[PDB]
Design an enzyme around this catalytic site. Structure first.
Site, PDB file in Angstrom:
ATOM      1  N   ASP A 124      -0.465  -6.138  -3.332  1.00  0.00           N
ATOM      2  CA  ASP A 124      -1.657  -6.553  -4.116  1.00  0.00           C
ATOM      3  C   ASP A 124      -2.075  -5.426  -5.111  1.00  0.00           C
ATOM      4  OD1 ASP A 124      -1.664  -9.040  -2.877  1.00  0.00           O
ATOM      5  OD2 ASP A 124      -3.606  -8.827  -1.944  1.00  0.00           O
ATOM      6  N   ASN A 163      -3.240   4.516  -2.362  1.00  0.00           N
ATOM      7  CA  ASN A 163      -3.407   4.420  -0.922  1.00  0.00           C
ATOM      8  C   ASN A 163      -4.879   4.472  -0.511  1.00  0.00           C
ATOM      9  OD1 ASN A 163      -4.054   7.059   0.875  1.00  0.00           O
ATOM     10  ND2 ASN A 163      -3.128   7.722  -1.060  1.00  0.00           N
ATOM     11  N   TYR A 173      -6.522 -11.169   6.615  1.00  0.00           N
ATOM     12  CA  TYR A 173      -7.116 -10.096   5.837  1.00  0.00           C
ATOM     13  C   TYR A 173      -8.566 -10.494   5.566  1.00  0.00           C
ATOM     14  CZ  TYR A 173      -7.037  -6.772   1.815  1.00  0.00           C
ATOM     15  OH  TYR A 173      -7.208  -5.707   0.945  1.00  0.00           O
TER      16      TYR A 173
HETATM   17  C1  LIG Z   1      -6.564  -2.965  -4.277  1.00  0.00           C
HETATM   18  C2  LIG Z   1      -5.466  -2.475  -3.312  1.00  0.00           C
HETATM   19  C3  LIG Z   1      -4.522  -3.398  -2.870  1.00  0.00           C
HETATM   20  C4  LIG Z   1      -3.485  -2.973  -1.975  1.00  0.00           C
HETATM   21  N1  LIG Z   1      -2.558  -3.901  -1.557  1.00  0.00           N
HETATM   22  C5  LIG Z   1      -1.550  -3.545  -0.671  1.00  0.00           C
HETATM   23  C6  LIG Z   1      -0.598  -4.492  -0.208  1.00  0.00           C
HETATM   24  O1  LIG Z   1      -0.552  -5.682  -0.541  1.00  0.00           O
HETATM   25  N2  LIG Z   1       0.385  -4.056   0.660  1.00  0.00           N
HETATM   26  C7  LIG Z   1       0.425  -2.766   1.076  1.00  0.00           C
HETATM   27  O2  LIG Z   1       1.281  -2.382   1.878  1.00  0.00           O
HETATM   28  N3  LIG Z   1      -0.489  -1.838   0.622  1.00  0.00           N
HETATM   29  C8  LIG Z   1      -1.467  -2.212  -0.253  1.00  0.00           C
HETATM   30  N4  LIG Z   1      -2.339  -1.239  -0.693  1.00  0.00           N
HETATM   31  C9  LIG Z   1      -2.105   0.222  -0.417  1.00  0.00           C
HETATM   32  C10 LIG Z   1      -1.252   1.067  -1.431  1.00  0.00           C
HETATM   33  O3  LIG Z   1      -1.370   0.535  -2.738  1.00  0.00           O
HETATM   34  C11 LIG Z   1       0.270   0.993  -1.071  1.00  0.00           C
HETATM   35  O4  LIG Z   1       0.477   1.688   0.154  1.00  0.00           O
HETATM   36  C12 LIG Z   1       1.212   1.711  -2.077  1.00  0.00           C
HETATM   37  O5  LIG Z   1       2.503   1.812  -1.436  1.00  0.00           O
HETATM   38  C13 LIG Z   1       0.892   3.173  -2.399  1.00  0.00           C
HETATM   39  O6  LIG Z   1       1.604   3.456  -3.604  1.00  0.00           O
HETATM   40  P1  LIG Z   1       1.176   4.624  -4.575  1.00  0.00           P
HETATM   41  O7  LIG Z   1       2.215   4.791  -5.637  1.00  0.00           O
HETATM   42  O8  LIG Z   1      -0.199   4.269  -5.260  1.00  0.00           O
HETATM   43  O9  LIG Z   1       1.116   5.842  -3.587  1.00  0.00           O
HETATM   44  P2  LIG Z   1       0.199   7.149  -3.344  1.00  0.00           P
HETATM   45  O10 LIG Z   1      -1.191   6.646  -2.953  1.00  0.00           O
HETATM   46  O11 LIG Z   1       0.210   7.989  -4.620  1.00  0.00           O
HETATM   47  O12 LIG Z   1       0.915   7.902  -2.195  1.00  0.00           O
HETATM   48  C14 LIG Z   1       0.998   7.229  -0.918  1.00  0.00           C
HETATM   49  C15 LIG Z   1       1.769   8.157  -0.003  1.00  0.00           C
HETATM   50  O13 LIG Z   1       3.140   8.259  -0.466  1.00  0.00           O
HETATM   51  C16 LIG Z   1       3.448   9.612  -0.697  1.00  0.00           C
HETATM   52  N5  LIG Z   1       4.312   9.558  -1.887  1.00  0.00           N
HETATM   53  C17 LIG Z   1       4.089   9.008  -3.100  1.00  0.00           C
HETATM   54  N6  LIG Z   1       5.179   9.197  -3.907  1.00  0.00           N
HETATM   55  C18 LIG Z   1       6.116   9.875  -3.185  1.00  0.00           C
HETATM   56  C19 LIG Z   1       7.421  10.323  -3.460  1.00  0.00           C
HETATM   57  N7  LIG Z   1       8.064  10.051  -4.610  1.00  0.00           N
HETATM   58  N8  LIG Z   1       8.088  10.965  -2.462  1.00  0.00           N
HETATM   59  C20 LIG Z   1       7.553  11.196  -1.208  1.00  0.00           C
HETATM   60  N9  LIG Z   1       6.250  10.734  -0.941  1.00  0.00           N
HETATM   61  C21 LIG Z   1       5.586  10.083  -1.901  1.00  0.00           C
HETATM   62  C22 LIG Z   1       2.083  10.260  -1.007  1.00  0.00           C
HETATM   63  O14 LIG Z   1       2.101  11.605  -0.698  1.00  0.00           O
HETATM   64  C23 LIG Z   1       1.221   9.550   0.009  1.00  0.00           C
HETATM   65  O15 LIG Z   1       1.407  10.150   1.269  1.00  0.00           O
HETATM   66  C24 LIG Z   1      -3.403  -1.664  -1.532  1.00  0.00           C
HETATM   67  C25 LIG Z   1      -4.338  -0.748  -1.988  1.00  0.00           C
HETATM   68  C26 LIG Z   1      -5.366  -1.149  -2.863  1.00  0.00           C
HETATM   69  C27 LIG Z   1      -6.312  -0.049  -3.260  1.00  0.00           C
HETATM   70  C1  LIG Z   2     -20.780 -11.232  -3.176  1.00  0.00           C
HETATM   71  C2  LIG Z   2     -19.357 -11.731  -3.306  1.00  0.00           C
HETATM   72  C3  LIG Z   2     -18.630 -11.083  -4.483  1.00  0.00           C
HETATM   73  C4  LIG Z   2     -17.111 -11.099  -4.306  1.00  0.00           C
HETATM   74  C5  LIG Z   2     -16.571  -9.701  -4.008  1.00  0.00           C
HETATM   75  C6  LIG Z   2     -15.134  -9.714  -3.493  1.00  0.00           C
HETATM   76  C7  LIG Z   2     -14.435  -8.446  -3.981  1.00  0.00           C
HETATM   77  C8  LIG Z   2     -13.083  -8.148  -3.342  1.00  0.00           C
HETATM   78  C9  LIG Z   2     -12.757  -6.688  -3.632  1.00  0.00           C
HETATM   79  C10 LIG Z   2     -11.408  -6.212  -3.111  1.00  0.00           C
HETATM   80  C11 LIG Z   2     -11.511  -4.782  -2.595  1.00  0.00           C
HETATM   81  C12 LIG Z   2     -10.306  -3.924  -2.947  1.00  0.00           C
HETATM   82  C13 LIG Z   2      -9.451  -3.697  -1.706  1.00  0.00           C
HETATM   83  C14 LIG Z   2      -9.315  -2.214  -1.368  1.00  0.00           C
HETATM   84  C15 LIG Z   2      -8.317  -1.974  -0.239  1.00  0.00           C
HETATM   85  C16 LIG Z   2      -7.145  -2.923  -0.336  1.00  0.00           C
HETATM   86  O1  LIG Z   2      -6.571  -3.299   0.673  1.00  0.00           O
END
Ligand SMILES: Cc1cc2nc3c(=O)[nH]c(=O)nc-3n(C[C@H](O)[C@H](O)[C@H](O)COP(=O)(O)OP(=O)(O)OC[C@H]3O[C@@H](n4cnc5c(N)ncnc54)[C@H](O)[C@@H]3O)c2cc1C
Ligand SMILES: CCCCCCCCCCCCCCCCO
Ligand SMILES: Cc1cc2nc3c(=O)[nH]c(=O)nc-3n(C[C@H](O)[C@H](O)[C@H](O)COP(=O)(O)OP(=O)(O)OC[C@H]3O[C@@H](n4cnc5c(N)ncnc54)[C@H](O)[C@@H]3O)c2cc1C
Ligand SMILES: CCCCCCCCCCCCCCCCO
Lengths: 540, 550
Positions: free
Chosen positions: A219, A157, A481
């Site tokens: 993602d 998250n 996005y």
């Molecule tokens: C590179 C990147 C890309 C992402 N892409 C998306 C995307 O496409 N769509 C999107 O919606 N989000 C995206 N996110 C955000 C995040 O990955 C999602 O919200 C995902 O659902 C969180 O999952 P997690 O297992 O890593 O949860 P955590 O970060 O570990 O927890 C998230 C929340 O859920 C709670 N939780 C976790 N497990 C439980 C459980 N079993 N019971 C009760 N509560 C629980 C935690 O306490 C916290 O409050 C992205 C983040 C990153 C960094």
């Molecule tokens: C100078 C241009 C270089 C390209 C860099 C693009 C990198 C994209 C990184 C993505 C970041 C990860 C997202 C974190 C939160 C997700 O929703």
């Protein structure tokens, strides 16, 4: 046995064994994976030089773990005594690494902070339960002893949802990731019972063995968990076919301080909706029954170029209007398209790159947009959808890039967060903002936001770069996005200012960001289910 | 502010001891004995086959023995309670024509439309009537009414069509002064947004009026319970009712974007936790829904509904399974077992418009049963809606699967007329009740493993139970929806009233059906109770919103 917190970088993204790096002295940027070492990405350096400028990458390394200070864990002998009576010693961790990896998520601010060793409040203990019954015990004990509990899945998250905020009480991080097994698959009902600490790829691998799939694809798919998806209602990029996560959830079990809440596989409250999206503030989900589908007989993914963002958008609109929709679509603006084509290190990919070259002689590359379009299902269905979508694409000046086998098309977004760690290591930063905006306002918001962000820094003599993509469409608009990047300075203030700029411009076009009688409703639920406020307190 | 000149309320236009339009009904022509249907648009159209069907199924010269309901002026209702200070406050904000407390108003806001409801009203058994009916004209007026009811500690029960069959509007006690809030004057579409495909609708609106008003603006909602004609949007939301185009348009919960709920502790507005699910299905126990923003669609380019016959129930079930597995599904499907099929064909009118071809399809049925025994032949109705290109693809796919399961096509008829005939069914229940008969229903979801055995066993068991008592009985079934591993199965069962007229005969038939459905794992109709109780005590501290024990 290695725990996942030891397998995933403690100050970056994803697999510890996978990373970008600069080959010296050529300066060539390469990608290393566990399966292949140092594959040159020869176009990437040229891209970074062009965009964010004798080119030198200035190294800004992260602090080593030995050099990071964390205050000692609090003491609660009588509670820890009770834990050790039921849990094995390998299930309880309080070393520096376990504490750091259960403090931070994966937002920009999280990474900046860990990378300079700024660790404000860590949890006092990490517990790794092995079953639903163990979770029940731990939650009962936390309630008895008044111990704050925060469940953790992948910790992916970006909203600070797992950050400890309760320095008055002993606080425990519950890492769910040892509960990672598909318990059963019912092939008549097309449902599966899954322990929710399972990671995305592991879930799809285990399901595939029994000939089925879930199809939820954020993602962050690679390093996030089912339990996290349920607790956040995360978006997935095949939702246009398989449904949203809340539709996929048939039932699940929630362990709360006041007992375990069970759900069944019409009137009355549909209770699952109380817990879905609750971010661990209403108890811990342990096991879920999820709707699954058969591994599809056809999976076909295609690339297309358009002359302008405008053309791609018109195609998006008319596809949705046709009511015959692909399994997945993403449209990249020219900046993200260029990035995609400089992401080239296979027989099918170089053929595509040749097609892009041909196209951009006539169509200016400053405006050319890539779209990736996928179809899954029975052959008869895929064929009808593909022919429908291609007809509309042809009417909107789309240029076929053809196909490759598989889905590695749709899996390119997974690598993006790895580039983020490389920028942070070389005096650069990158953040994101996502908005819903109507078709009427899209193209002005897109153009204005991009022009405004770049000029803001240009005026200060600082390079900056911004791109955008469309992941989902609704009746009268899109999910847009932005990814935006610049140089680090010599505080947190620069990232807060850039975000402010972006947030302001997005609001300016009624793009979406994020007396309330529902506050009293939530307070009722919270006070009833968790009267001692032990469940992830003080979270929005 | 007043209702317009010549306005009459819907509670006066819907039968107070029966179903639907007061002007529409089946009746026996005399001296011929022929059964006929009257509607406000045409009187006494013979149904020449219907008497002979009833004769055959539920039995010397055949006579329908007449059992009329009591007239309204012969029914006792205890005087209403008085709350002078509460009523006087109402009169500072509400017009006299919005306030009703005569016998007709009181009875029509006591009962829904279950068999037990009809049996009781028909014999003048009225134990817990509301004291006053209020008919608000706007969201603001509901807010005023609910504020006053909370201040004065007055029970409030909202009603739409009063079509529920579970007793959900019937007052449970008489401790406190009680008001029925009839929502049906709040019956306008407020706006349509064709770009967003949403519409804001006052939820007292009845089904046909909703579809009519939306159609004027080029859109449709597509929620179609069998009670569509005489139920309201507000009731659909408060009950989460099923709809028979849900395979295309989704369930009511997903059609609901947002709505406004007036509660004793304030108005809950809708735009983490998805709060709409707290009020959907709440049956008036958590406040009054006033206006809803619903997801709508464009009026379909193509609407094509077809009938088909199958040689056996087994063939029809196989076709249904193969249709769902193919993933290319119709907008609507219904499979009628042989007994419901026979009923359908026996209900043919002797008259029709020049643009109507029921006689063509009756004739095809009659030719078909020369080759296939009529005791096993099943009718299916299958409908497709959407863009021409989509309807074409889905129809060709489905029609291929049908031909592999021995389906025989009867052809289309204009629009949804094939699917509109189910609306006429509850009028026959009133006819049965006036002539010494009764009919009730049982609906269940059952797995494919257990579907055909439950169907056969239930029909046999029900018939035998009364046949052993020397009493005629009849039972049919249809399938309305299918799922990955099962279907929704609906039984309709009927017999004679007993010469001693006691409500014990109906509970006994119901028990037999309930028992056997339970044997075969059919659906029927928990730390979550403390959750609900907390929501209830918070939203409604004085327990004025449709108070229940459980
Ligand atoms: C590179 C990147 C890309 C992402 N892409 C998306 C995307 O496409 N769509 C999107 O919606 N989000 C995206 N996110 C955000 C995040 O990955 C999602 O919200 C995902 O659902 C969180 O999952 P997690 O297992 O890593 O949860 P955590 O970060 O570990 O927890 C998230 C929340 O859920 C709670 N939780 C976790 N497990 C439980 C459980 N079993 N019971 C009760 N509560 C629980 C935690 O306490 C916290 O409050 C992205 C983040 C990153 C960094
Ligand atoms: C100078 C241009 C270089 C390209 C860099 C693009 C990198 C994209 C990184 C993505 C970041 C990860 C997202 C974190 C939160 C997700 O929703
Ligand atoms: C012949 C017949 C066929 C039927 N077919 C179906 C079917 O196919 N599918 C199905 O699901 N049901 C069916 N039903 C049942 C019933 O029609 C449905 O439940 C329908 O949704 C009830 O709507 P209504 O307007 O008549 O509600 P009412 O009976 O007036 O009230 C139902 C409940 O909703 C509450 N309520 C009503 N309006 C509001 C409001 N605005 N705010 C808050 N609460 C409110 C009431 O207090 C009550 O608790 C059928 C019933 C009959 C008699
Ligand atoms: C032997 C002939 C019997 C006549 C057939 C009667 C079938 C009519 C079913 C009507 C039931 C509609 C009301 C049920 C109440 C709940 O929905």
């Amino acid at each position: 046995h290695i725990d996942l917190y030891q397998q995933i970088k403690w100050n970056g993204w994803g697999d510890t064994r996978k990373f970008l790096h600069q080959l010296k002295p050529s300066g060539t940027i390469a990608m290393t994976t566990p399966e292949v070492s140092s594959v040159p990405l020869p176009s990437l350096r040229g891209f970074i030089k062009k965009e964010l400028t004798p080119f030198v990458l200035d190294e800004t390394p992260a602090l080593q773990i030995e050099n990071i200070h964390v205050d000692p864990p609090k003491q609660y002998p009588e509670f820890v005594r009770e834990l050790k009576a039921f849990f094995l010693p390998d299930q309880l961790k309080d070393d520096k690494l376990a504490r750091i990896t259960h403090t931070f998520g994966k937002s920009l601010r999280d990474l900046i902070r860990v990378r300079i060793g700024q660790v404000k409040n860590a949890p006092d203990l990490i517990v790794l339960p092995h079953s639903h019954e163990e979770v029940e015990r731990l939650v009962q004990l936390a309630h008895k002893y008044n111990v704050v509990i925060i469940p953790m899945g992948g910790g992916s998250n970006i909203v600070g949802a797992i950050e400890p905020v309760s320095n008055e009480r002993f606080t425990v991080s519950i890492d769910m990731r040892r509960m990672n097994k598909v318990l059963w698959v019912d092939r008549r009902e097309m449902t599966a019972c899954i322990q929710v600490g399972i990671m995305g790829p592991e879930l799809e691998k285990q399901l595939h063995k029994q000939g089925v799939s879930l199809g939820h694809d954020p993602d962050s798919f690679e390093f996030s968990t089912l339990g996290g998806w349920l607790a956040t209602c995360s978006s997935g990029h095949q939702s246009d076919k398989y449904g949203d996560i809340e539709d996929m959830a048939v039932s699940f079990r929630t362990v709360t301080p006041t007992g375990t809440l069970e759900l069944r596989n019409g009137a009355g409250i549909n209770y699952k909706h109380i817990i879905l999206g609750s971010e661990g503030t209403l108890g811990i989900i342990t096991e879920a029954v999820m709707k699954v589908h058969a591994v599809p007989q056809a999976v076909e993914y295609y690339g297309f170029l358009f002359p302008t963002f405008a053309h791609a958008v018109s195609a998006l609109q008319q596809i949705r209007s046709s009511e015959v929709i692909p399994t997945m679509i993403r449209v990249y603006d020219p900046e993200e398209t260029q990035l995609s084509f400089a992401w080239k290190p296979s027989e099918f990919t170089s053929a595509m790159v040749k097609k892009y070259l041909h196209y951009i002689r006539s169509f200016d590359f400053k405006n050319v947009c890539l779209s990736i379009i996928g179809f899954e299902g029975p052959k008869k269905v895929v064929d009808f959808h593909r022919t429908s979508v291609f007809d509309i694409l042809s009417k909107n000046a789309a240029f076929g890039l053809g196909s490759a086998p598989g889905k590695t098309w749709a899996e390119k977004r997974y690598d993006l967060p790895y580039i983020r760690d490389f920028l942070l290591d070389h005096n650069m930063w990158v953040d994101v903002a996502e908005t819903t905006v109507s078709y009427a306002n899209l193209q002005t918001l897109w153009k204005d936001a991009k022009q405004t962000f770049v000029k803001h820094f240009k005026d200060q003599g600082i390079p900056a770069w911004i791109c955008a993509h469309i992941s989902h469409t609704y009746t009268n608009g899109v999910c847009l996005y932005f990814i935006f990047a610049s140089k680090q300075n010599e505080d947190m203030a620069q990232y807060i200012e850039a975000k402010k700029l972006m947030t302001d411009i997005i609001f300016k076009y009624g793009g979406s960001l994020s007396t309330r009688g529902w506050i009293n409703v939530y307070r009722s639920l919270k006070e009833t289910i968790d009267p001692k406020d032990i469940c992830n307190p003080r979270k929005l």
